[PDB]
Amino acid sequence: QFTNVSCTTSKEAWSVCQRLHNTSRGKCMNKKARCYS
């Protein structure tokens, strides 16, 4: 239940946490998208 996209800013990839699962809690690391439901 994790994503493997590319992220830099923790606001960018919040429509990736929505469309995959059904949440709006998400932060990313150094280089990749993660989700925090």
Side-chain angles (χ1 to χ4, degrees), residues 2-37:
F2 291 102
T3 40
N4 49 290
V5 206
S6 45
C7 177
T8 47
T9 45
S10 52
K11 199 176 188 183
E12 203 180 4
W14 287 31
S15 53
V16 186
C17 273
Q18 206 287 116
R19 290 261 65 224
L20 208 303
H21 302 280
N22 44 67
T23 201
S24 297
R25 291 84 60 98
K27 165 182 77 175
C28 59
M29 210 175 196
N30 48 286
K31 290 171 68 177
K32 71 186 191 300
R34 208 173 184 180
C35 208
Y36 277 126
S37 188

PDB file of all heavy atoms in Angstrom, unseen atoms left out:
ATOM      1  N   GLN A   1       0.825  -1.177   0.000  1.00  0.00           N
ATOM      2  CA  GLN A   1       0.000   0.000   0.000  1.00  0.00           C
ATOM      3  C   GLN A   1       0.869   1.241   0.000  1.00  0.00           C
ATOM      4  O   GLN A   1       0.642   2.185   0.756  1.00  0.00           O
ATOM      5  CB  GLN A   1      -0.875  -0.166   1.266  1.00  0.00           C
ATOM      6  CG  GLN A   1      -0.173  -1.220   2.141  1.00  0.00           C
ATOM      7  CD  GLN A   1       0.698  -1.909   1.133  1.00  0.00           C
ATOM      8  N   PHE A   2       1.905   1.235  -0.879  1.00  0.00           N
ATOM      9  CA  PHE A   2       2.892   2.278  -1.038  1.00  0.00           C
ATOM     10  C   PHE A   2       2.915   2.624  -2.506  1.00  0.00           C
ATOM     11  O   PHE A   2       2.464   1.851  -3.350  1.00  0.00           O
ATOM     12  CB  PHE A   2       4.304   1.811  -0.580  1.00  0.00           C
ATOM     13  CG  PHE A   2       4.313   1.630   0.918  1.00  0.00           C
ATOM     14  CD1 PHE A   2       4.222   0.349   1.491  1.00  0.00           C
ATOM     15  CD2 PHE A   2       4.398   2.750   1.766  1.00  0.00           C
ATOM     16  CE1 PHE A   2       4.211   0.189   2.882  1.00  0.00           C
ATOM     17  CE2 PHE A   2       4.392   2.592   3.159  1.00  0.00           C
ATOM     18  CZ  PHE A   2       4.299   1.311   3.716  1.00  0.00           C
ATOM     19  N   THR A   3       3.462   3.828  -2.824  1.00  0.00           N
ATOM     20  CA  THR A   3       3.592   4.406  -4.146  1.00  0.00           C
ATOM     21  C   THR A   3       5.079   4.419  -4.466  1.00  0.00           C
ATOM     22  O   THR A   3       5.920   4.390  -3.568  1.00  0.00           O
ATOM     23  CB  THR A   3       2.978   5.808  -4.208  1.00  0.00           C
ATOM     24  OG1 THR A   3       3.251   6.549  -3.025  1.00  0.00           O
ATOM     25  CG2 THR A   3       1.446   5.713  -4.369  1.00  0.00           C
ATOM     26  N   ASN A   4       5.418   4.457  -5.778  1.00  0.00           N
ATOM     27  CA  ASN A   4       6.775   4.429  -6.276  1.00  0.00           C
ATOM     28  C   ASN A   4       6.836   5.380  -7.447  1.00  0.00           C
ATOM     29  O   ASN A   4       7.286   5.031  -8.537  1.00  0.00           O
ATOM     30  CB  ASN A   4       7.279   2.987  -6.626  1.00  0.00           C
ATOM     31  CG  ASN A   4       6.321   2.151  -7.506  1.00  0.00           C
ATOM     32  OD1 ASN A   4       5.249   1.727  -7.057  1.00  0.00           O
ATOM     33  ND2 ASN A   4       6.744   1.899  -8.782  1.00  0.00           N
ATOM     34  N   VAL A   5       6.399   6.649  -7.199  1.00  0.00           N
ATOM     35  CA  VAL A   5       6.457   7.795  -8.103  1.00  0.00           C
ATOM     36  C   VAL A   5       7.693   8.597  -7.711  1.00  0.00           C
ATOM     37  O   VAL A   5       8.503   8.127  -6.918  1.00  0.00           O
ATOM     38  CB  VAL A   5       5.161   8.626  -8.063  1.00  0.00           C
ATOM     39  CG1 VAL A   5       4.942   9.386  -9.392  1.00  0.00           C
ATOM     40  CG2 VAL A   5       3.971   7.684  -7.798  1.00  0.00           C
ATOM     41  N   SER A   6       7.872   9.825  -8.259  1.00  0.00           N
ATOM     42  CA  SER A   6       8.928  10.759  -7.909  1.00  0.00           C
ATOM     43  C   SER A   6       8.297  11.973  -7.272  1.00  0.00           C
ATOM     44  O   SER A   6       7.335  12.535  -7.793  1.00  0.00           O
ATOM     45  CB  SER A   6       9.843  11.152  -9.101  1.00  0.00           C
ATOM     46  OG  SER A   6       9.114  11.449 -10.291  1.00  0.00           O
ATOM     47  N   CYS A   7       8.859  12.391  -6.110  1.00  0.00           N
ATOM     48  CA  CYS A   7       8.395  13.544  -5.348  1.00  0.00           C
ATOM     49  C   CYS A   7       9.593  14.298  -4.825  1.00  0.00           C
ATOM     50  O   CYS A   7      10.647  13.732  -4.547  1.00  0.00           O
ATOM     51  CB  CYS A   7       7.380  13.161  -4.244  1.00  0.00           C
ATOM     52  SG  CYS A   7       6.775  14.504  -3.151  1.00  0.00           S
ATOM     53  N   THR A   8       9.402  15.635  -4.670  1.00  0.00           N
ATOM     54  CA  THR A   8      10.349  16.596  -4.132  1.00  0.00           C
ATOM     55  C   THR A   8       9.656  17.367  -3.019  1.00  0.00           C
ATOM     56  O   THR A   8      10.203  17.502  -1.927  1.00  0.00           O
ATOM     57  CB  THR A   8      10.961  17.525  -5.192  1.00  0.00           C
ATOM     58  OG1 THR A   8       9.984  18.079  -6.074  1.00  0.00           O
ATOM     59  CG2 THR A   8      11.983  16.724  -6.027  1.00  0.00           C
ATOM     60  N   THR A   9       8.427  17.901  -3.293  1.00  0.00           N
ATOM     61  CA  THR A   9       7.634  18.739  -2.399  1.00  0.00           C
ATOM     62  C   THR A   9       6.448  17.944  -1.901  1.00  0.00           C
ATOM     63  O   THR A   9       5.746  17.313  -2.688  1.00  0.00           O
ATOM     64  CB  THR A   9       7.160  20.040  -3.063  1.00  0.00           C
ATOM     65  OG1 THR A   9       6.631  19.843  -4.373  1.00  0.00           O
ATOM     66  CG2 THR A   9       8.362  20.993  -3.168  1.00  0.00           C
ATOM     67  N   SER A  10       6.174  17.996  -0.565  1.00  0.00           N
ATOM     68  CA  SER A  10       5.090  17.297   0.121  1.00  0.00           C
ATOM     69  C   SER A  10       3.806  18.120   0.107  1.00  0.00           C
ATOM     70  O   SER A  10       3.385  18.689   1.114  1.00  0.00           O
ATOM     71  CB  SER A  10       5.494  16.839   1.557  1.00  0.00           C
ATOM     72  OG  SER A  10       6.044  17.889   2.349  1.00  0.00           O
ATOM     73  N   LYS A  11       3.174  18.152  -1.093  1.00  0.00           N
ATOM     74  CA  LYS A  11       1.928  18.813  -1.407  1.00  0.00           C
ATOM     75  C   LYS A  11       1.576  18.390  -2.816  1.00  0.00           C
ATOM     76  O   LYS A  11       0.401  18.199  -3.128  1.00  0.00           O
ATOM     77  CB  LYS A  11       1.902  20.363  -1.275  1.00  0.00           C
ATOM     78  CG  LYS A  11       0.467  20.910  -1.165  1.00  0.00           C
ATOM     79  CD  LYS A  11       0.400  22.427  -0.946  1.00  0.00           C
ATOM     80  CE  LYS A  11      -1.026  22.908  -0.652  1.00  0.00           C
ATOM     81  NZ  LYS A  11      -1.073  24.382  -0.518  1.00  0.00           N
ATOM     82  N   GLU A  12       2.612  18.212  -3.698  1.00  0.00           N
ATOM     83  CA  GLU A  12       2.628  17.725  -5.070  1.00  0.00           C
ATOM     84  C   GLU A  12       1.906  16.413  -5.373  1.00  0.00           C
ATOM     85  O   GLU A  12       1.186  16.298  -6.363  1.00  0.00           O
ATOM     86  CB  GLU A  12       4.123  17.537  -5.448  1.00  0.00           C
ATOM     87  CG  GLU A  12       4.441  17.563  -6.949  1.00  0.00           C
ATOM     88  CD  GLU A  12       5.942  17.371  -7.199  1.00  0.00           C
ATOM     89  OE1 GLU A  12       6.705  17.155  -6.222  1.00  0.00           O
ATOM     90  OE2 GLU A  12       6.342  17.440  -8.392  1.00  0.00           O
ATOM     91  N   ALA A  13       2.140  15.394  -4.505  1.00  0.00           N
ATOM     92  CA  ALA A  13       1.790  13.997  -4.689  1.00  0.00           C
ATOM     93  C   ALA A  13       0.676  13.564  -3.758  1.00  0.00           C
ATOM     94  O   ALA A  13       0.618  12.413  -3.326  1.00  0.00           O
ATOM     95  CB  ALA A  13       3.048  13.122  -4.512  1.00  0.00           C
ATOM     96  N   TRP A  14      -0.255  14.509  -3.441  1.00  0.00           N
ATOM     97  CA  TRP A  14      -1.412  14.349  -2.568  1.00  0.00           C
ATOM     98  C   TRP A  14      -2.649  13.878  -3.314  1.00  0.00           C
ATOM     99  O   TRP A  14      -3.580  13.359  -2.700  1.00  0.00           O
ATOM    100  CB  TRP A  14      -1.731  15.654  -1.785  1.00  0.00           C
ATOM    101  CG  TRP A  14      -0.728  15.940  -0.682  1.00  0.00           C
ATOM    102  CD1 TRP A  14       0.606  15.641  -0.621  1.00  0.00           C
ATOM    103  CD2 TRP A  14      -1.081  16.449   0.616  1.00  0.00           C
ATOM    104  NE1 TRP A  14       1.099  15.918   0.619  1.00  0.00           N
ATOM    105  CE2 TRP A  14       0.084  16.389   1.407  1.00  0.00           C
ATOM    106  CE3 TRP A  14      -2.287  16.901   1.149  1.00  0.00           C
ATOM    107  CZ2 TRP A  14       0.061  16.735   2.750  1.00  0.00           C
ATOM    108  CZ3 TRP A  14      -2.315  17.236   2.512  1.00  0.00           C
ATOM    109  CH2 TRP A  14      -1.163  17.120   3.306  1.00  0.00           C
ATOM    110  N   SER A  15      -2.658  14.023  -4.677  1.00  0.00           N
ATOM    111  CA  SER A  15      -3.647  13.510  -5.613  1.00  0.00           C
ATOM    112  C   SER A  15      -3.261  12.118  -6.098  1.00  0.00           C
ATOM    113  O   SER A  15      -3.979  11.514  -6.888  1.00  0.00           O
ATOM    114  CB  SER A  15      -3.862  14.484  -6.814  1.00  0.00           C
ATOM    115  OG  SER A  15      -2.648  14.837  -7.471  1.00  0.00           O
ATOM    116  N   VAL A  16      -2.099  11.588  -5.607  1.00  0.00           N
ATOM    117  CA  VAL A  16      -1.558  10.264  -5.883  1.00  0.00           C
ATOM    118  C   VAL A  16      -1.997   9.325  -4.772  1.00  0.00           C
ATOM    119  O   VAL A  16      -2.332   8.176  -5.037  1.00  0.00           O
ATOM    120  CB  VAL A  16      -0.033  10.270  -6.041  1.00  0.00           C
ATOM    121  CG1 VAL A  16       0.494   8.885  -6.475  1.00  0.00           C
ATOM    122  CG2 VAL A  16       0.348  11.334  -7.095  1.00  0.00           C
ATOM    123  N   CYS A  17      -2.053   9.820  -3.499  1.00  0.00           N
ATOM    124  CA  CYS A  17      -2.626   9.177  -2.315  1.00  0.00           C
ATOM    125  C   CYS A  17      -4.152   9.026  -2.347  1.00  0.00           C
ATOM    126  O   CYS A  17      -4.710   8.189  -1.639  1.00  0.00           O
ATOM    127  CB  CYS A  17      -2.268   9.993  -1.032  1.00  0.00           C
ATOM    128  SG  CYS A  17      -0.667   9.537  -0.307  1.00  0.00           S
ATOM    129  N   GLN A  18      -4.846   9.857  -3.173  1.00  0.00           N
ATOM    130  CA  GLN A  18      -6.284   9.955  -3.331  1.00  0.00           C
ATOM    131  C   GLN A  18      -6.811   8.970  -4.356  1.00  0.00           C
ATOM    132  O   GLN A  18      -7.767   8.237  -4.106  1.00  0.00           O
ATOM    133  CB  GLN A  18      -6.628  11.405  -3.755  1.00  0.00           C
ATOM    134  CG  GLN A  18      -8.042  11.880  -3.385  1.00  0.00           C
ATOM    135  CD  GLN A  18      -9.159  11.266  -4.237  1.00  0.00           C
ATOM    136  OE1 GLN A  18     -10.011  10.534  -3.718  1.00  0.00           O
ATOM    137  NE2 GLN A  18      -9.150  11.581  -5.567  1.00  0.00           N
ATOM    138  N   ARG A  19      -6.164   8.969  -5.551  1.00  0.00           N
ATOM    139  CA  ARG A  19      -6.461   8.183  -6.747  1.00  0.00           C
ATOM    140  C   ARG A  19      -6.104   6.702  -6.658  1.00  0.00           C
ATOM    141  O   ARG A  19      -6.702   5.888  -7.360  1.00  0.00           O
ATOM    142  CB  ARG A  19      -5.763   8.797  -7.996  1.00  0.00           C
ATOM    143  CG  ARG A  19      -6.372  10.147  -8.426  1.00  0.00           C
ATOM    144  CD  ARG A  19      -7.363  10.043  -9.599  1.00  0.00           C
ATOM    145  NE  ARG A  19      -8.561   9.236  -9.167  1.00  0.00           N
ATOM    146  CZ  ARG A  19      -9.151   8.250  -9.915  1.00  0.00           C
ATOM    147  NH1 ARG A  19      -8.658   7.888 -11.133  1.00  0.00           N
ATOM    148  NH2 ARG A  19     -10.256   7.617  -9.423  1.00  0.00           N
ATOM    149  N   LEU A  20      -5.127   6.328  -5.780  1.00  0.00           N
ATOM    150  CA  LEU A  20      -4.644   4.984  -5.523  1.00  0.00           C
ATOM    151  C   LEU A  20      -5.446   4.336  -4.409  1.00  0.00           C
ATOM    152  O   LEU A  20      -5.999   3.249  -4.575  1.00  0.00           O
ATOM    153  CB  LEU A  20      -3.149   5.078  -5.137  1.00  0.00           C
ATOM    154  CG  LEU A  20      -2.236   3.867  -5.441  1.00  0.00           C
ATOM    155  CD1 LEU A  20      -2.657   2.512  -4.834  1.00  0.00           C
ATOM    156  CD2 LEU A  20      -1.950   3.731  -6.951  1.00  0.00           C
ATOM    157  N   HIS A  21      -5.517   5.024  -3.236  1.00  0.00           N
ATOM    158  CA  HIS A  21      -6.237   4.608  -2.052  1.00  0.00           C
ATOM    159  C   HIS A  21      -7.474   5.476  -1.957  1.00  0.00           C
ATOM    160  O   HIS A  21      -8.367   5.366  -2.796  1.00  0.00           O
ATOM    161  CB  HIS A  21      -5.348   4.716  -0.784  1.00  0.00           C
ATOM    162  CG  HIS A  21      -4.102   3.892  -0.906  1.00  0.00           C
ATOM    163  ND1 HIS A  21      -4.038   2.529  -0.704  1.00  0.00           N
ATOM    164  CD2 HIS A  21      -2.846   4.270  -1.273  1.00  0.00           C
ATOM    165  CE1 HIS A  21      -2.755   2.160  -0.948  1.00  0.00           C
ATOM    166  NE2 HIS A  21      -1.995   3.181  -1.293  1.00  0.00           N
ATOM    167  N   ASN A  22      -7.533   6.359  -0.928  1.00  0.00           N
ATOM    168  CA  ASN A  22      -8.642   7.252  -0.645  1.00  0.00           C
ATOM    169  C   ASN A  22      -8.271   8.051   0.588  1.00  0.00           C
ATOM    170  O   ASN A  22      -8.962   7.994   1.603  1.00  0.00           O
ATOM    171  CB  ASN A  22     -10.059   6.569  -0.499  1.00  0.00           C
ATOM    172  CG  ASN A  22     -10.077   5.266   0.335  1.00  0.00           C
ATOM    173  OD1 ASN A  22      -9.847   5.269   1.549  1.00  0.00           O
ATOM    174  ND2 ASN A  22     -10.374   4.121  -0.354  1.00  0.00           N
ATOM    175  N   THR A  23      -7.160   8.836   0.527  1.00  0.00           N
ATOM    176  CA  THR A  23      -6.697   9.631   1.651  1.00  0.00           C
ATOM    177  C   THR A  23      -6.115  10.910   1.083  1.00  0.00           C
ATOM    178  O   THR A  23      -6.105  11.122  -0.129  1.00  0.00           O
ATOM    179  CB  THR A  23      -5.764   8.846   2.591  1.00  0.00           C
ATOM    180  OG1 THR A  23      -5.695   9.420   3.889  1.00  0.00           O
ATOM    181  CG2 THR A  23      -4.338   8.633   2.042  1.00  0.00           C
ATOM    182  N   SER A  24      -5.628  11.803   1.985  1.00  0.00           N
ATOM    183  CA  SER A  24      -5.091  13.110   1.674  1.00  0.00           C
ATOM    184  C   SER A  24      -3.969  13.352   2.652  1.00  0.00           C
ATOM    185  O   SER A  24      -3.568  14.492   2.872  1.00  0.00           O
ATOM    186  CB  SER A  24      -6.139  14.257   1.797  1.00  0.00           C
ATOM    187  OG  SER A  24      -7.201  14.086   0.868  1.00  0.00           O
ATOM    188  N   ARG A  25      -3.423  12.262   3.265  1.00  0.00           N
ATOM    189  CA  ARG A  25      -2.258  12.283   4.131  1.00  0.00           C
ATOM    190  C   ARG A  25      -1.195  11.547   3.362  1.00  0.00           C
ATOM    191  O   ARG A  25      -1.366  10.395   2.970  1.00  0.00           O
ATOM    192  CB  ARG A  25      -2.452  11.630   5.527  1.00  0.00           C
ATOM    193  CG  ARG A  25      -3.389  12.399   6.483  1.00  0.00           C
ATOM    194  CD  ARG A  25      -4.892  12.127   6.305  1.00  0.00           C
ATOM    195  NE  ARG A  25      -5.158  10.658   6.527  1.00  0.00           N
ATOM    196  CZ  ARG A  25      -5.606  10.112   7.702  1.00  0.00           C
ATOM    197  NH1 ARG A  25      -5.885  10.891   8.785  1.00  0.00           N
ATOM    198  NH2 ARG A  25      -5.772   8.759   7.783  1.00  0.00           N
ATOM    199  N   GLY A  26      -0.076  12.257   3.116  1.00  0.00           N
ATOM    200  CA  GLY A  26       0.979  11.831   2.243  1.00  0.00           C
ATOM    201  C   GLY A  26       2.073  12.820   2.451  1.00  0.00           C
ATOM    202  O   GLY A  26       1.841  14.013   2.615  1.00  0.00           O
ATOM    203  N   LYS A  27       3.319  12.314   2.494  1.00  0.00           N
ATOM    204  CA  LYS A  27       4.542  13.071   2.558  1.00  0.00           C
ATOM    205  C   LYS A  27       5.464  12.216   1.736  1.00  0.00           C
ATOM    206  O   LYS A  27       5.214  11.026   1.549  1.00  0.00           O
ATOM    207  CB  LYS A  27       5.000  13.324   4.028  1.00  0.00           C
ATOM    208  CG  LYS A  27       6.442  13.808   4.255  1.00  0.00           C
ATOM    209  CD  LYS A  27       6.833  13.991   5.731  1.00  0.00           C
ATOM    210  CE  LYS A  27       7.117  12.664   6.454  1.00  0.00           C
ATOM    211  NZ  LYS A  27       7.607  12.902   7.831  1.00  0.00           N
ATOM    212  N   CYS A  28       6.570  12.805   1.223  1.00  0.00           N
ATOM    213  CA  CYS A  28       7.556  12.116   0.423  1.00  0.00           C
ATOM    214  C   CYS A  28       8.891  12.264   1.089  1.00  0.00           C
ATOM    215  O   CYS A  28       9.044  13.005   2.060  1.00  0.00           O
ATOM    216  CB  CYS A  28       7.541  12.591  -1.052  1.00  0.00           C
ATOM    217  SG  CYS A  28       7.848  14.339  -1.437  1.00  0.00           S
ATOM    218  N   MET A  29       9.901  11.512   0.574  1.00  0.00           N
ATOM    219  CA  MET A  29      11.193  11.307   1.192  1.00  0.00           C
ATOM    220  C   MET A  29      12.191  12.241   0.554  1.00  0.00           C
ATOM    221  O   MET A  29      11.988  13.454   0.541  1.00  0.00           O
ATOM    222  CB  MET A  29      11.570   9.801   1.143  1.00  0.00           C
ATOM    223  CG  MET A  29      12.458   9.347   2.316  1.00  0.00           C
ATOM    224  SD  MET A  29      12.763   7.555   2.328  1.00  0.00           S
ATOM    225  CE  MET A  29      13.343   7.490   4.047  1.00  0.00           C
ATOM    226  N   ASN A  30      13.283  11.692  -0.027  1.00  0.00           N
ATOM    227  CA  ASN A  30      14.302  12.407  -0.770  1.00  0.00           C
ATOM    228  C   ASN A  30      13.943  12.584  -2.238  1.00  0.00           C
ATOM    229  O   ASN A  30      14.182  13.641  -2.819  1.00  0.00           O
ATOM    230  CB  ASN A  30      15.728  11.797  -0.572  1.00  0.00           C
ATOM    231  CG  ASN A  30      15.790  10.264  -0.749  1.00  0.00           C
ATOM    232  OD1 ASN A  30      15.342   9.506   0.120  1.00  0.00           O
ATOM    233  ND2 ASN A  30      16.387   9.813  -1.893  1.00  0.00           N
ATOM    234  N   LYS A  31      13.380  11.520  -2.868  1.00  0.00           N
ATOM    235  CA  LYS A  31      13.195  11.432  -4.302  1.00  0.00           C
ATOM    236  C   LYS A  31      11.922  10.708  -4.699  1.00  0.00           C
ATOM    237  O   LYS A  31      11.694  10.586  -5.901  1.00  0.00           O
ATOM    238  CB  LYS A  31      14.370  10.663  -4.975  1.00  0.00           C
ATOM    239  CG  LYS A  31      15.718  11.402  -4.984  1.00  0.00           C
ATOM    240  CD  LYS A  31      16.887  10.521  -5.451  1.00  0.00           C
ATOM    241  CE  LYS A  31      16.833  10.133  -6.935  1.00  0.00           C
ATOM    242  NZ  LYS A  31      18.029   9.345  -7.312  1.00  0.00           N
ATOM    243  N   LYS A  32      11.064  10.180  -3.776  1.00  0.00           N
ATOM    244  CA  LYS A  32       9.980   9.309  -4.192  1.00  0.00           C
ATOM    245  C   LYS A  32       8.784   9.543  -3.335  1.00  0.00           C
ATOM    246  O   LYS A  32       8.920   9.930  -2.177  1.00  0.00           O
ATOM    247  CB  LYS A  32      10.351   7.812  -4.202  1.00  0.00           C
ATOM    248  CG  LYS A  32      10.544   7.149  -2.831  1.00  0.00           C
ATOM    249  CD  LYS A  32      11.054   5.715  -2.978  1.00  0.00           C
ATOM    250  CE  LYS A  32      11.017   4.901  -1.677  1.00  0.00           C
ATOM    251  NZ  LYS A  32      11.842   5.521  -0.615  1.00  0.00           N
ATOM    252  N   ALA A  33       7.565   9.251  -3.885  1.00  0.00           N
ATOM    253  CA  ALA A  33       6.261   9.454  -3.284  1.00  0.00           C
ATOM    254  C   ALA A  33       5.959   8.344  -2.299  1.00  0.00           C
ATOM    255  O   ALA A  33       6.258   7.180  -2.554  1.00  0.00           O
ATOM    256  CB  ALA A  33       5.178   9.495  -4.387  1.00  0.00           C
ATOM    257  N   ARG A  34       5.361   8.711  -1.139  1.00  0.00           N
ATOM    258  CA  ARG A  34       4.965   7.792  -0.096  1.00  0.00           C
ATOM    259  C   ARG A  34       3.593   8.257   0.332  1.00  0.00           C
ATOM    260  O   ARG A  34       3.110   9.293  -0.122  1.00  0.00           O
ATOM    261  CB  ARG A  34       5.997   7.746   1.065  1.00  0.00           C
ATOM    262  CG  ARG A  34       6.024   6.407   1.821  1.00  0.00           C
ATOM    263  CD  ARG A  34       7.173   6.339   2.830  1.00  0.00           C
ATOM    264  NE  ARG A  34       7.192   4.969   3.447  1.00  0.00           N
ATOM    265  CZ  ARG A  34       8.117   4.593   4.385  1.00  0.00           C
ATOM    266  NH1 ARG A  34       9.046   5.481   4.841  1.00  0.00           N
ATOM    267  NH2 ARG A  34       8.112   3.317   4.867  1.00  0.00           N
ATOM    268  N   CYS A  35       2.918   7.477   1.213  1.00  0.00           N
ATOM    269  CA  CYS A  35       1.563   7.717   1.633  1.00  0.00           C
ATOM    270  C   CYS A  35       1.546   7.297   3.073  1.00  0.00           C
ATOM    271  O   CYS A  35       2.308   6.428   3.498  1.00  0.00           O
ATOM    272  CB  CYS A  35       0.506   6.964   0.768  1.00  0.00           C
ATOM    273  SG  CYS A  35      -1.097   7.827   0.716  1.00  0.00           S
ATOM    274  N   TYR A  36       0.683   7.969   3.861  1.00  0.00           N
ATOM    275  CA  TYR A  36       0.744   7.986   5.305  1.00  0.00           C
ATOM    276  C   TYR A  36      -0.676   8.003   5.802  1.00  0.00           C
ATOM    277  O   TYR A  36      -1.099   8.937   6.479  1.00  0.00           O
ATOM    278  CB  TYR A  36       1.521   9.248   5.793  1.00  0.00           C
ATOM    279  CG  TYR A  36       3.012   9.034   5.763  1.00  0.00           C
ATOM    280  CD1 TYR A  36       3.831   9.943   5.079  1.00  0.00           C
ATOM    281  CD2 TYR A  36       3.618   7.956   6.437  1.00  0.00           C
ATOM    282  CE1 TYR A  36       5.218   9.788   5.055  1.00  0.00           C
ATOM    283  CE2 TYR A  36       5.012   7.803   6.427  1.00  0.00           C
ATOM    284  CZ  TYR A  36       5.816   8.725   5.741  1.00  0.00           C
ATOM    285  OH  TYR A  36       7.223   8.607   5.771  1.00  0.00           O
ATOM    286  N   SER A  37      -1.444   6.927   5.495  1.00  0.00           N
ATOM    287  CA  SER A  37      -2.813   6.743   5.936  1.00  0.00           C
ATOM    288  C   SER A  37      -2.793   6.130   7.349  1.00  0.00           C
ATOM    289  O   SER A  37      -2.275   4.990   7.490  1.00  0.00           O
ATOM    290  CB  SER A  37      -3.614   5.826   4.978  1.00  0.00           C
ATOM    291  OG  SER A  37      -4.997   5.798   5.309  1.00  0.00           O
TER     292      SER A  37
END
